[PDB]
Amino acid sequence: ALQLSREQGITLRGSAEIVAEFFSFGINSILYQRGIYPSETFTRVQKYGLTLLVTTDLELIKYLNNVVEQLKDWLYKCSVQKLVVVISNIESGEVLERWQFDIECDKTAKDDSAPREKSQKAIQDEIRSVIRQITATVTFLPLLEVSCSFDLLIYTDKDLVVPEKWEESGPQFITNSEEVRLRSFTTTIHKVNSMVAYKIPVND
């Protein structure tokens, strides 16, 4: 008659892993729901103890896998601090939607070799909060009267560790856009604040 807590701990690189697949699935679902891509062509998986929208665009599949591992890297070096997905029009390309994710890492993870008290339960349910939240957010995002495309902006403070194919670019603000913040979530190593900017409606 006994049991036992056996807490595993957390790592720099484990945080990077989990938050990477976080953004993976979150981006999947965002670009699924608002209509950005062919919804019909997608499907569902089980992750985070819940159900998730997953694509089949081999193009975007490999692309975002590259992005995922590269972010895993830059987290493992705390390199990036912003992650944004800017959605715009097709031809005139005017920005309609801009999901900003502002990133906190752990420099002390250099010396923070010993783990930190926080459970897969806790992190998992908090990302579930995030996911369900973003999902809900569709209930008020002013619908896209057209079809759209999107571009991927980040901000790593270092202009230093830049791999080959990535190029420097511009800020890409919006003139008349409201910004609304979502719940926060962290790892005690990485936190990510989240807030969507979206073009203020022309007419009420």
Binding site: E59, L60, Y63, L152, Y155, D159, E167, E168, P171
Partner: peptide, 9 residues
């Protein structure tokens, strides 16, 4: 910083 790749059509 602000870094981009090719978004497929």
């Amino acid at each position: 910083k602000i870094l981009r790749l090719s978004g497929k059509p």
